[PDB]
Design a protein around this ligand. Structure first.
Ligand SMILES: O=C(O)COc1cc(Cl)c(Cl)cc1Cl
Ligand SMILES: O=C(O)COc1cc(Cl)c(Cl)cc1Cl
Lengths: 116, 116, 116, 116
C-alpha cells in the first residue's frame, strides 16, 4: 500500500471515523484530476486508495473532508477541509502515510515517507 | 485588520520571515480569484491584506509558500505549500488570525477569531 | 520581557483566557522551586512573569493548568496539565515565548526565541 | 497492551527511533514513583511497558526524552523532554496510546483512549 491516510480526533481522543478523503493528481494541463477516494475506517485509517503501478510520479493533493466530519457530529468547524499537497515518487517509489489530527478550529498534518 | 496571517518555524524556534502568502476568494463558478498577497515580516506576520469593506462573507483560501521557504534555507521539505480554506461569517467575531507552525514534513494551523 | 506565555483554544478558535500558569526553576538538589505565576489575559497572554536580572541561565518548567481551564468550560479533558521544560541559554536570543495550543485530548507547544 | 507510545519526527518524516521513555505514577505521598520504561522501536512504537494487572488507577507521567533523541542526531533542541500527565483507569480499565510529533523547538501530543 503506497498511500495511506490516518485521521485522529483531538476532542474525543479517538480515531476520526467515516472521514471522506479525495485524492487528486495534477495533470499535464495543470488541472487537478481526480485520482482516488475513500473514507476512514473504525481505526481512523484509509487503505487501498491506489496501487504501486497507478501511483506514478506527480503532484498529489489529499483532501480530507473535515467540515463534513464535524458537521455530522453537529459541530460547526472553521475549515472547509484539510488539504495536503506534495510531490510523490520523484526519487522512485515510496510509501506515504498522511496523518491528520483534527480540532474544530485547528488541524495538524504530518507525513511519514518510507522506502520499501 | 480583518485578516492577519502569522507563520512560525519549528526547526529554528523563530518567526518564519519572508514567506509568500497568497489569499484567494472562491468565485461563483467555483474558481479561486486572487484577493490579496504579501510576504511575512521579521515577526512572521502579514498585516494589511484587506479592509473590512472588501472582506465580505464567502470562502477564502490562504496559500502559504512553505516549499520556497524551506528551499531558501537549504532544507528539503515535503509539502508544496500549506493551504487553509475557510468560510468568513458575519455572525462570528470580526477579526481572523490564521496561524501556521511549520516543520519540513509537518505543519499545524489554527484560527483565532475574535472581536475588539 | 524575557519570558512570555501564550495559550490558544482549538475548540472555540479563541485565546485561552484565565488559564493559570506556574513557572519553576530547577534547584541544585533537582527540586522545582517556584519562580513566577499568573493567569492568561483576555488575549491569551501572560506577560511580566520575570525580569532580565532575575531570569538567569538554568532549567525552567512552565506548567499550564489545562484541566481547570476545560473543567471551567464544562468539558472533560485528558491531561492534568501541560508542562514545558527547557534550558534558558545566554548564547541564544534574549526573549522566550512559550506558546501552547489546547484541545481536550491533545496539545501542541512551540518556543519562539528572538532578539530585539 | 494498555499503554503504548508512538513518536514521529517532523524534520525527517519518519518514525522517531530509539527514543527513551520513562513512565511514573504518583504515589500516596504525592511523589512520582518510577513505573515503567523503554525505548521506541524502528516503527517509532513502544509496546510492553505494563500489564493490565499492574496498570491500576492513578495519575501517570509519560516522559519522552526528546533532548536525548535530538542530541544523538547532533541537533541542539529547545525542550528537555515532552511530559504527558494524565489520570488513567478512573472509570475502569482503558487502553491508552500516547502519540508525540517532534520538532527541535516544538512538539504535539495527543491521546487515543479506547474501551476494550
Ligand atoms: O498564535 C500565536 O500568536 C502564537 O502561538 C501559536 C502559533 C501557532 Cl503558528 C500555533 Cl499553530 C499555535 C500557537 Cl499557540
Ligand atoms: O498515529 C501516528 O502515526 C502517531 O501519532 C500521530 C498521529 C497523528 Cl494523526 C498525527 Cl498528526 C501525529 C502523530 Cl505523532
Amino acid at each position: 500500500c503506497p498511500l495511506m491516510v490516518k485521521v485522529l480526533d483531538a476532542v474525543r481522543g479517538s480515531p476520526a471515523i467515516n472521514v471522506a478523503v479525495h485524492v487528486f493528481r495534477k495533470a499535464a494541463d495543470d488541472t487537478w484530476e481526480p485520482f482516488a477516494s475513500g473514507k476512514t475506517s473504525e481505526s481512523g485509517e484509509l487503505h487501498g486508495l491506489t496501487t504501486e503501478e497507478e501511483f506514478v510520479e506527480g503532484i498529489y493533493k489529499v483532501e480530507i473532508d473535515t467540515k463534513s466530519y464535524w458537521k455530522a457530529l453537529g459541530i460547526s468547524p472553521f475549515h472547509e477541509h484539510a488539504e495536503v499537497v506534495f510531490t510523490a515518487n520523484d526519487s522512485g517509489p515510496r510509501r506515504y502515510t498522511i496523518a491528520a489530527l483534527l480540532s474544530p478550529y485547528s488541524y495538524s498534518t504530518t507525513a511519514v515517507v518510507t522506502n520499501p
